Write a protein that binds this ligand. Structure first.
Ligand SMILES: *[C@@H]1O[C@H](CO)[C@@H](O[C@@H]2O[C@H](CO)[C@@H](O[C@@H]3O[C@H](CO)[C@@H](O)[C@H](O[C@H]4O[C@H](CO)[C@@H](O)[C@H](O)[C@@H]4O)[C@@H]3O)[C@H](O)[C@H]2NC(C)=O)[C@H](O)[C@H]1NC(C)=O
Ligand SMILES: *[C@@H]1O[C@H](CO)[C@@H](O[C@@H]2O[C@H](CO)[C@@H](O[C@@H]3O[C@H](CO)[C@@H](O)[C@H](O[C@H]4O[C@H](CO)[C@@H](O)[C@H](O)[C@@H]4O)[C@@H]3O)[C@H](O)[C@H]2NC(C)=O)[C@H](O)[C@H]1NC(C)=O
Ligand SMILES: *[C@@H]1O[C@H](CO)[C@@H](O[C@@H]2O[C@H](CO)[C@@H](O)[C@H](O)[C@H]2NC(C)=O)[C@H](O)[C@H]1NC(C)=O
Ligand SMILES: *[C@@H]1O[C@H](CO)[C@@H](O[C@@H]2O[C@H](CO)[C@@H](O)[C@H](O)[C@H]2NC(C)=O)[C@H](O)[C@H]1NC(C)=O
Ligand SMILES: *[C@@H]1O[C@H](CO)[C@@H](O[C@@H]2O[C@H](CO)[C@@H](O)[C@H](O)[C@H]2NC(C)=O)[C@H](O)[C@H]1NC(C)=O
Ligand code: NAG
Lengths: 118, 142, 252, 116
């Protein structure tokens, strides 16, 4: 968990990036978002065509604070005008310190990717 | 001592590839067959060289273009890279390394051909150069 | 003797079949390249074969690079011997194969853009040109230019209609019904129909029709007549219809 | 904008004022039919007009034909661009004019018989 994870230093994942086509089907494991992109995922459904993707996704609900353990959340995906139209399963865990980890699964259909709010 | 000389010959093709990169800074390749973009999106493509003798040979793009079909000799061409230099009349065109090393990359804002065309293909033509025999860096100005 | 050289991307392989080298007199094959350490080995692709492998570089095993404007040639020399020391006759296979320096590469993925579009719709209408003509000679081969034509009742009367408009291949000029009226206007009450309801009015035997509704032009022949009363003017008219030559037929 | 379309007896043409499109922002225009070989050209009758000419038939330059029981229509799409590549504001002028199937004809010559 907090010690066994792969970092992602990507500055194009922020909710400010123009538009891309990247889709994350090879994302496997627990990740620690690091860099100018941000440390935590999106908390509200970000508008369409952002995060270097056509249909970005977001973590629905609120992040768990310190000392919460393993939590189950369902990362919704905004597309076509109906926020959270496809669903993916994520497992967030807080960490000792100012950072998080996520169980990043593959979205059901490609041209979906996660964001990080700066 | 007398010698007998048998002379034989042959021909071979180096291997040069093209790939579409899913991210800026050209990090991961694309494993799809058709990609749907918006015209406001940038395009991040590049060429590799797997043939061999990368020490003496530097990959370099003499000319690259786009055609609305798979056919590469199509009369309709938009020269993305014209005569070893990136297009200057289009501001959204930039190259990173052309002839510097064994891999060349460039980026172009996506377009769509005017008329009854709904697809855009890409084709370059590569000219390998010797790193030490001659000077390969293309530096052009208006 | 058979030679097979595969000048691959980075491997230059020279091979000689041992099944023939045995019969050639070499009971044990020594396969030295220009560098004595690039000794040959055994492989089996189509049969038991001996071969050497030299990387396609500048001097990994003695290869020498010769550069031309359009090609790069990699030169080397083989060496054969039935033992370590030769006295009878040296054997050298001066093998070399060149690569090109001008290639073409194509992106293998179709790339489809999307963009917002606006569609302004503009309409209109035109008219197919159909002109009616008078023939004063048989076989329908000579038109009449004058405005006024005076001809006896007994003599026949030949009238032709021809479609001048485009798309002649797709459209055949049908002739719904013709009539003759003693006035320029087509609204006149008393009329003399020549062809009634797509087929000729046959109550008068002096009427005959040729090539009606089959080509771009139709025609008919009808005897001259005098309207009852003090009507010395006969202005005949007709209206035509167009058929789709494949969906239906215009033969009545 | 302005689009004058005259549906002639044999062929149809769509014309656009050069001054109007120059003011609209197109220095040089590319008029493309359903097939790009019907590129627009220049012709002047009362002002500068850039125009396209298409035969009024089924297929000579992509003109679709769909005839119903009473009229027959010849529909072709038009494309306009200030360059070879469109990058924003793709423009399509969907033009079509229909011809009637029922027409009236009459001789222009006065006839005069006589009976003894
Ligand atoms: C720079 O160097 C390149 C690489 O060598 C060179 O290309 C060579 O051109 C020569 C001249 O034509 C070719 O020489 C061969 O010589 C004999 C006849 O003299 C034949 O073996 C060849 O003809 C055959 O060519 C084909 C076989 O590959 C077949 O069509 C057929 O069998 C012909 O008979 C040929 O003439 C030599 O083969 C090529 N090298 C290749 C093709 O790899 C180039 O010309 C040089 N440029 C200069 C000097 O400006
Ligand atoms: C067979 O197909 C033909 C050709 O498509 C069709 O004739 C069309 O009829 C419709 C319905 O009347 C017309 O549609 C137009 O639609 C809008 C309004 O909805 C207007 O542009 C038109 O009204 C105009 O009418 C006059 C035209 O100048 C003017 O008074 C004025 O501009 C009005 O706005 C019109 O309603 C269409 O234009 C015609 N096509 C013509 C006239 O060429 C026909 O009805 C079909 N027959 C069938 C289905 O049985
Ligand atoms: C995130 O957490 C889950 C739950 O611990 C990990 O394992 C999955 O557990 C469910 C429930 O039994 C299984 O159905 C899944 O098959 C498990 N996943 C795999 C890949 O086997 C899950 O792996 C974690 N995800 C990441 C991306 O690390
Ligand atoms: C690629 O495009 C050309 C042009 O459309 C195709 O047709 C050839 O056109 C050239 C002139 O451009 C003629 O000289 C040739 O005779 C045409 N035929 C051939 C077979 O070359 C050409 O066929 C297309 N190639 C492929 C592989 O589809
Ligand atoms: C052509 O002339 C006639 C005769 O003056 C005009 O009026 C028609 O007259 C006939 C015979 O009485 C009637 O059957 C028609 O109904 C009349 N048509 C009308 C009133 O519209 C006729 O209008 C003239 N036609 C034209 C096109 O001018
Ligand atoms: C995810 O959380 C959002 C934000 O409160 C909520 O609207 C949505 O219903 C949640 N998703 C599901 C599947 O309940």
């Amino acid at each position: 968990p907090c010690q066994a994870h792969r970092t992602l230093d990507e500055y194009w994942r922020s909710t400010e990036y123009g538009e891309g086509y990247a889709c994350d089907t090879d994302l496997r494991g627990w990740y620690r978002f690091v860099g100018q992109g941000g440390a935590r995922m999106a908390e509200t459904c970000v508008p369409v065509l952002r995060c270097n993707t056509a249909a970005p996704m977001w973590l629905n609900g609120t992040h768990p604070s310190s000392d919460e353990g393993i939590v189950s959340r369902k990362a919704c995906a905004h597309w076509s005008g109906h926020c959270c139209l496809w669903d993916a399963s994520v497992q967030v865990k807080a960490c000792a310190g100012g950072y998080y980890v996520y169980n990043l699964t593959a979205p059901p259909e490609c041209h979906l990717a996660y964001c990080t709010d700066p």
